[PDB]
Design a protein around this ligand. Sequence first.
Ligand SMILES: O=C(O)CNc1ncnc2oc(-c3ccccc3)c(-c3ccccc3)c12
Length: 257
Amino acid sequence: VEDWDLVQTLGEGAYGEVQLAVNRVTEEAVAVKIVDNIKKEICINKMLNHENVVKFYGHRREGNIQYLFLEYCSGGELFDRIEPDIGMPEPDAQRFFHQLMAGVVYLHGIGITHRDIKPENLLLDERDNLKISDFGLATVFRYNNRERLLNKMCGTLPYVAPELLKRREFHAEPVDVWSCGIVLTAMLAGELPWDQPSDSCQEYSDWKEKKTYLNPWKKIDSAPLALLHKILVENPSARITIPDIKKDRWYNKPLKK
Ligand SMILES: O=C(O)CNc1ncnc2oc(-c3ccccc3)c(-c3ccccc3)c12
């Protein structure tokens, strides 16, 4: 019941590799994440339990090495379901977005922000269920019911919210909302809107000026685009929140059997 074969390397991570491990008796599969910040990742993982969040099973100290034992997601990355310049069918996009909201609602409800939401970190199981992955940059933004503001910049530039480049301190939750928006834009367009949301960025100025007759917006369609108008608001205090994304017309539009 103990004893696991490493059966292939799933990918190269930035830190180690990730290995598929199968159980010699039960044939159960797990991903094994090898690290030669990591203590906090393990600590946060122990906190987490939800259907659209990669399951943490355990961890091995083994000398110097840290072995992380996580849900195997045989669907790979949502990134690989996005066709360059096309995106994916809108009903597929909408389902993925529902599940991503479920995962993000769950984290925010336990005071956790992930801070690096992007399709490379949205993994898919055998049934195309979406699992949020890699708490490597995640942190606690609410504890004993009291919010702490963030002031450390991290994430990935094309998905980062504007306030994170402009302000010394900023709320955690609107940043994760913004990045879900870029993830939506991608799924529906096959294309990232800007390299960063800086006023030194023409594509960002064009969006603030409302020129939706350009790409990527023009590929999109007025119901999902209207929702994107409420997510990608420069002022995070004015940005739509999750409870209200849930009231959105497109979000609630029937599309998929
Ligand atoms: O990369 C992470 O940090 C965790 N990675 C994973 N965790 C849990 N299950 C997984 O299934 C994969 C995977 C699945 C099918 C094909 C290829 C890879 C991957 C995968 C993906 C890219 C890089 C590294 C691994 C994966």
